[PDB]
Amino acid sequence: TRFASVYAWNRKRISNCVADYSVLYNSASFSTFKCYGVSPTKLNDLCFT
Amino acid sequence: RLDPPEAEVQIDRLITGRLQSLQTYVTQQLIRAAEIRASANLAATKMSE
């Protein structure tokens, strides 16, 4: 619910899990879905540093 | 990591590089192998005489 301004953007951290991007690829109000460098369809096969 | 429609300009940058590295080796070997045949005849006429 609470979001901050761009002048004070903050970051997060993600640790060891097993998380699936298939649910993240479901339909939503996302107007833009653009990743450059990695195919957006093979994202659920590799381990990430 | 990529898609066949996209992973087709990053293979043609490797093929043309790895192919223009064998013909140089073959050409240099061809030039070098014609200098042993110029001694294998001197050593043959130095035995009959």
Swiss-Prot record, chain B:
Changing residue 45 to I: In strain: Gamma/P.1. It comes from the Viruses. Subunit of the fusion protein that is processed upon entry into the host cell. Mediates fusion of the virion and cellular membranes by functioning as a class I viral fusion protein. Contains a viral fusion peptide that is unmasked after S2 cleavage. This cleavage can occur at the cell membrane by host TMPRSS2 or during endocytosis by host CSTL. In either case, this triggers an extensive and irreversible conformational change that leads to fusion of the viral envelope with the cellular cytoplasmic membrane, releasing viral genomic RNA into the host cell cytoplasm. This is Spike protein S2'. It comes from Severe acute respiratory syndrome coronavirus 2 (2019-nCoV). The chain holds residues 983 to 1031 of 1273 of the full protein.
